[PDB]
Design an enzyme around this catalytic site. Structure first.
Site, PDB file in Angstrom:
ATOM      1  N   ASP A 232       3.064   7.384  -4.193  1.00 50.40           N
ATOM      2  CA  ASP A 232       3.654   6.119  -4.656  1.00 50.40           C
ATOM      3  C   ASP A 232       4.754   6.443  -5.679  1.00 50.40           C
ATOM      4  OD1 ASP A 232       0.421   4.341  -4.878  1.00 50.40           O
ATOM      5  OD2 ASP A 232       1.624   4.951  -3.164  1.00 50.40           O
ATOM      6  N   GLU A 503      -4.338  -6.562  -2.286  1.00 53.90           N
ATOM      7  CA  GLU A 503      -3.382  -6.722  -1.206  1.00 53.90           C
ATOM      8  C   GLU A 503      -3.912  -7.791  -0.250  1.00 53.90           C
ATOM      9  OE1 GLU A 503      -1.802  -2.079  -1.360  1.00 53.90           O
ATOM     10  OE2 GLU A 503      -3.779  -2.650  -0.546  1.00 53.90           O
ATOM     11  N   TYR A 615      -3.655   1.975   5.881  1.00 50.33           N
ATOM     12  CA  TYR A 615      -2.773   0.831   5.913  1.00 50.33           C
ATOM     13  C   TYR A 615      -2.351   0.558   7.358  1.00 50.33           C
ATOM     14  CZ  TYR A 615      -2.235   0.276   0.865  1.00 50.33           C
ATOM     15  OH  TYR A 615      -2.468   0.032  -0.479  1.00 50.33           O
TER      16      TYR A 615
HETATM   17  O1  LIG Z   1      -3.002   4.024  -3.586  1.00 48.59           O
HETATM   18  S1  LIG Z   1      -3.006   3.339  -2.267  1.00 48.59           S
HETATM   19  O2  LIG Z   1      -4.159   2.395  -2.152  1.00 48.59           O
HETATM   20  O3  LIG Z   1      -3.091   4.353  -1.134  1.00 48.59           O
HETATM   21  C1  LIG Z   1      -1.499   2.435  -2.216  1.00 48.59           C
HETATM   22  C2  LIG Z   1      -1.167   1.658  -3.477  1.00 48.59           C
HETATM   23  N1  LIG Z   1       0.207   1.185  -3.607  1.00 48.59           N
HETATM   24  C3  LIG Z   1       0.302   0.352  -4.812  1.00 48.59           C
HETATM   25  C4  LIG Z   1       1.584   0.501  -5.643  1.00 48.59           C
HETATM   26  C5  LIG Z   1       2.502  -0.514  -5.674  1.00 48.59           C
HETATM   27  C6  LIG Z   1       3.719  -0.361  -6.468  1.00 48.59           C
HETATM   28  C7  LIG Z   1       3.923   0.796  -7.166  1.00 48.59           C
HETATM   29  C8  LIG Z   1       2.987   1.846  -7.133  1.00 48.59           C
HETATM   30  O4  LIG Z   1       3.205   3.017  -7.855  1.00 48.59           O
HETATM   31  C9  LIG Z   1       1.794   1.685  -6.357  1.00 48.59           C
END
Ligand SMILES: O=S(=O)(O)CCNCc1cccc(O)c1
Length: 658
Positions: A232, A503, A615
């Protein structure tokens, strides 16, 4: 060219098959190619498919094998005790098990190339590892080998790594075949890549798929073009889109919906070793979490994504600041000029940069592209590139100018180091995208903005209402527009959760009745309900019969156009597992016209319960099939970071699901 050995139709039922008599004496030269077409839909925990070994007592570490794990991982061992060489190469999540109820014929091409000193593995057309060594150990050069074996490795006269599966065709070549010749090997894949390593994005990794069937029949997809591994933010990420005008059969070379240029669009091979795998691009702006919707009225397509300035992400985003200053009812973007200790600047209408401390306008303005102009002249910063040449990650100026952007590190004017949300629009159903625009704050001047739920917005079938789900601490913050996304309002809906990646995705059960499925921290998928076309929301409930892990995973949901078993049908896409992100499922639910309750009647396993599924995106294709574009791996696990070509598309028909 031509095979030295060719066999097939081998059944591996926990007994090895001897092919030593036939194979061994044919081996010659130091370079080889294996071609194996095999099925394993009930694999053992760890099994060898093929092995050259020294089976003599006291040489148990003299063998070559091609092995797999029941998690879908593939690899070879090349071990020679007398050379002091024990090589082990592998990549998690490289296989298929089942599809539409049938065992997948997996196609494996392993090349051992003595001139380049490089081993390379392909599975179903995907290069899954390529390793050069200082010291090449040919697989035929292992000291004292005396067995060629299928479904086991013969060490000291015993069958190790016994396999359960079948090898429909195996071939061998006293040659290291070229990358081009590999591509001419026919595959039996049940999947497709939409985006892929080496495409126009020049991103080696992809994450967070979307799918949305446009009214013309075009099917649209957005995704994270992730450059700095599959991390991320903080990292470099662009939003890329592709489309299919043929019901998901073919797809267009992708373009960028949302992009930044402070860092090169680089195709890196990101290290997967424990010492380096958490290297992270740290000075780059990025986008993350795209969501897509089509507006009936203006005909436009709308796409939103989270936006991050240089160095910023989930963990270090300035909470307690929205990044905007509210002066007299309206919201204005805060900036910080190089050398200040505070945000003594704002961005008013028509872009003009105002010094707050003196209320005076400056000579700087801010164009549509959030670029800086001085005196109406656009400023530039130098681009960055990354490399691992020194052995660690290194981020350095590449001597190429790019326009100055208030989200960049080297900008004279910088936004507030927190998370934002932006939209873009296409007038041509994904052939081009306008310059993105920041959404205003919703939860106040002194709160970091919410987080976009990746997937689809809902376009309500009986109004002009467009809805994008977002989340923050304690609540789902729905974003409603009734004017082609020209203006937005928020509908908040409390959830019994603090710090959840809530989400959320929505389906329309009937006109004005929105049910939203979302990710929780309790191991169970939640849901709520609106009956004023999104104006107010019910308390939260949970689904039984589907399982998620504690940290949970994104869930995709759709309203099937057709009646199934005579009833209204909703479809859910998600991992069904309490252990990790695997055991993918499409789960079909019939609605009760009496109470709007959904009876989850059909579960369809996308692949084996032990194969990664994360996802996902689901759409109803114009021919009423179902397209699924998903992370075919455990995108949570630290052992499956940085894999290429694991986001895959499949085509399904309803009867497959029932
Ligand atoms: O960590 S996961 O569940 O695989 C995905 C999470 N994504 C969230 C997010 C949204 C915006 C910025 C981020 O650093 C992280």
């Amino acid at each position: 060219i031509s095979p030295i050995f060719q066999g097939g139709s081998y059944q591996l039922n926990n007994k090895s098959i001897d092919i030593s008599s036939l194979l061994l004496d044919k081996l010659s030269g130091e370079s080889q190619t294996v071609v194996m077409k095999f099925k394993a839909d009930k694999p053992n925990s760890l099994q060898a498919l093929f092995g050259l070994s020294n089976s003599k007592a006291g040489f148990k570490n003299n063998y070559f094998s091609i092995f797999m794990r029941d998690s879908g991982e593939i690899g070879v061992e090349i071990r020679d005790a007398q050379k002091g060489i024990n090589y082990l190469f592998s990549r998690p999540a490289s296989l298929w098990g089942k599809h539409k109820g049938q065992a997948v014929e997996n196609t494996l091409v392993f090349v051992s190339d003595s001139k380049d000193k490089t081993y390379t593995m392909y599975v179903n057309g995907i290069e899954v590892f390529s390793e050069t060594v200082d010291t090449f150990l040919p697989i035929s050069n292992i000291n004292g080998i005396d067995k060629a074996t299928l479904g086991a490795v013969n060490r000291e006269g015993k069958e190790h790594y016994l396999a359960k599966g079948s090898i429909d065709e195996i071939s061998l070549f006293n040659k290291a075949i070229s990358d081009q010749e590999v591509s001419t090997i026919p595959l039996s894949n049940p999947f497709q890549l939409i985006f892929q390593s080496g495409d126009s994005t020049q991103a080696n990794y992809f994450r967070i798929p979307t799918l949305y069937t446009l009214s013309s029949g075009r099917v649209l997809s957005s995704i994270d073009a992730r450059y700095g591994g599959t991390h991320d933010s903080k990292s470099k990420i662009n939003i890329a889109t592709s489309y299919s005008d043929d019901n998901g059969k073919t797809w267009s070379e992708p373009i960028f919906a949302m992009k930044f240029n402070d860092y090169e669009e680089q195709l890196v091979y990101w290290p997967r070793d424990n010492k380096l795998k958490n290297s992270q691009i740290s000075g780059s702006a990025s986008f993350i979490d795209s969501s897509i919707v089509e507006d009936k009225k203006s005909g436009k397509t709308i796409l939103l994504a989270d936006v991050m300035p240089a160095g910023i992400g989930n963990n270090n985003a300035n909470k307690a600041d929205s990044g905007f200053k509210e002066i007299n009812g309206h919201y204005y973007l805060k900036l910080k000029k190089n050398g200040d200790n505070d945000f003594r600047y704002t961005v008013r209408e028509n872009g003009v940069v105002y010094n707050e401390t003196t209320n005076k306008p400056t000579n700087y303005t801010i164009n549509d592209k959030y670029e800086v102009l001085e005196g109406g002249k656009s400023l530039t910063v130098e681009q960055y590139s990354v490399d691992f040449d020194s052995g660690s990650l290194r981020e350095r100026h590449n001597g190429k100018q790019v326009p100055m952007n208030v989200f960049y590190k080297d900008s004279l004017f910088k936004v507030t180091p927190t998370n934002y949300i932006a939209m873009t629009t296409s007038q041509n159903r994904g052939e081009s995208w306008e310059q993105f625009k920041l959404l205003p704050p919703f939860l106040g001047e002194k709160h970091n903005g919410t987080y976009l739920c990746p997937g689809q917005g809902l376009a309500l079938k009986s109004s002009n209402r467009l809805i994008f789900a977002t989340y923050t601490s304690g609540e789902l913050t729905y974003l409603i527009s009734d004017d082609s996304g020209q203006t937005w309002k928020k509908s908040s809906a409390s959830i019994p959760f603090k710090n959840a990646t809530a989400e959320a995705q929505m389906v329309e059960l009937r006109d004005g009745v929105i049910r939203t499925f979302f990710r929780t921290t309790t191991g169970k998928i939640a849901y709520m309900t609106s009956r004023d076309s999104g104006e107010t929301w019910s308390k939260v409930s949970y689904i039984d019969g589907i399982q998620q892990t504690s940290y949970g995973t994104q869930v995709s949901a759709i309203k099937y156009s057709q009646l199934i078993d005579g009833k209204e049908a909703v479809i859910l896409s998600t991992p069904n597992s309490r252990s990790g992100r695997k055991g993918g499922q499409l789960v079909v639910g019939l609605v009760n016209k009496e109470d709007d309750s959904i009876d989850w009647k059909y579960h369809y396993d996308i692949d084996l319960p032990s194969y990664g599924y994360a996802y996902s995106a689901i759409t109803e294709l114009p021919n009423h099939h179902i397209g699924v574009l998903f992370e075919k791996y455990d995108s949570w696990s630290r052992n499956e970071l940085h894999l290429s070509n694991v986001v895959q598309y499949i085509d399904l028909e309803i009867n497959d699901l029932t």
